[PDB]
Design a protein around this ligand. Structure first.
Ligand code: HEM
Ligand SMILES: Brc1ccc(-c2c[nH]cn2)cc1
Length: 367
């Protein structure tokens, strides 16, 4: 991947293959993400469908097509304003003790002789925390893991990031069943003037959409710290903050995102017609030598680090404060708890957009 990224950054940072456009450089990736009025996120016809969702002309549709992720202002801003305070660093910091205690309890379960830390640590932690945050109970741990795994790039369905089918219908039933038992942010959504379809979409987005990405950050951090032999230096030079930021830059859990042009636009030397998909490679931008000195090197105290792994602009990841907090606490506690790590076996996430591990089997020496 990354050698190809370098080639495109050098010869062809803005590339048309006869179907869609792909962007590989930092400057044009950032330009795309921030220019919401020319590069639209409404890939599912949310704006076009809004009135008939709300007046009930549209009776049946896929709830997760219609969330803030696939909308433009003002609809986007109005949606996000209902939960933006909950996910701010100021408000999340209350949760620090709960997350730290949950982490150490997950660490307890680890057989240091041989264990899968994706299965023991990285997968359960985001699910437990978001369930706490939303007041939506984990009734079946296995169902919640399966629901979290529904998240995927979906070829030919732009904007759609959920695998559908029987599992998805079960998720919907679950949310309907616990609508009225949630915390205050859930109540905001439920009591709003959104259509039922939008309400379901919104709740599912918050409950499920962030689990695997956060799991992937934790897994990728463990891999990166181990492979480049940084555990001691990070521990002793207290580099947790900047090291996790560098893991974000170097091993982005979300490799790319996409936009659709609202009008003819110019991006660098190229002219993109209206109604074109523009895929923006976060992973490649994150190594742009014009922005990051020695971009191919993992530097645990890297500074500055304006990486695009949470995006940029108005859609800048709502969960970024939360993901940073969980990851930092997970790594800190893990680092405090174990002296030595050997990677015994790995299985990557196999598909296009998500970058992380299905299995991470390690041998550890505890203190
Ligand atoms: C390491 C973990 C994570 C990474 C790398 C990540 C990445 C991203 C990226 C790149 C975007 C922008 C997509 C775009 O511009 O089209 C985004 C948006 C979003 N993310 Fe995350 N994310 C993470 C964790 C989370 C978590 C934990 C949650 C929820 C609890 C979450 C919820 C959202 C939401 C709701 C949006 C839409 C924001 C909007 O449209 O205004 N993410 N994320
Ligand atoms: Br495919 C895919 C792309 C982005 C997600 C950002 C995602 N989740 C939370 N923030 C999830 C799946």
């Amino acid at each position: 991947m990354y050698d190809w990224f370098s080639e495109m950054r050098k010869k062809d940072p803005v590339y048309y293959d006869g179907n869609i456009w792909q962007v590989f450089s930092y400057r044009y990736t950032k330009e795309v993400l921030n220019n919401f009025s020319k590069f639209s996120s409404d890939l599912t016809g949310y704006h076009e469908r809004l009135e008939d969702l709300r007046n009930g002309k549209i009776r049946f549709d896929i709830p997760t097509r219609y969330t803030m992720l696939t909308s433009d202002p003002p609809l986007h801003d109005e949606l996000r304003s209902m939960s933006a305070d909950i996910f701010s660093p100021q408000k999340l910091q209350t949760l620090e003790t709960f997350i730290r205690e949950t982490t150490r309890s997950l660490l307890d379960s680890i057989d240091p002789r041989e264990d899968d830390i994706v299965k023991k640590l990285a997968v359960p932690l985001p699910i437990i925390v978001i369930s706490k945050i939303l007041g939506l109970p984990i009734e079946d741990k296995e169902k919640f893991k399966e629901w979290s795994d529904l998240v995927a790039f979906r070829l030919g369905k732009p904007g759609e990031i959920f695998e559908l089918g029987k599992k998805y219908l079960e998720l919907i039933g679950y949310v309907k069943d616990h609508l009225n038992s949630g915390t205050e942010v859930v109540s905001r959504v439920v009591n709003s003037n959104l259509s039922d379809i939008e309400k379901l979409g919104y709740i599912i987005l918050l409950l499920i959409a962030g689990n695997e990405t956060t799991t992937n950050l934790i897994s990728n951090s463990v891999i990166d710290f181990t492979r480049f032999n940084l555990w001691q230096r990070i521990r002793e030079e207290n580099l947790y903050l900047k090291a996790i930021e560098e893991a974000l830059r170097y091993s982005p859990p979300v490799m790319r995102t996409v936009r659709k042009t609202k009008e003819r636009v110019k991006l660098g030397d190229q002219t993109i017609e209206e109604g074109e998909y523009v895929r923006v490679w976060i992973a490649s931008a994150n190594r742009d030598e014009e922005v990051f000195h020695d971009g191919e090197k993992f530097i645990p105290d890297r500074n500055p680090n304006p990486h695009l792994s949470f995006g940029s602009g108005i859609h800048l990841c709502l969960g970024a404060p939360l993901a940073r907090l969980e990851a930092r606490i997970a790594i800190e506690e893990f680092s405090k708890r174990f002296r030595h790590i050997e990677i015994l076996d790995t299985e990557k996430v196999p598909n296009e957009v998500l970058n992380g591990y299905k299995r991470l089997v390690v041998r550890l020496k505890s203190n």
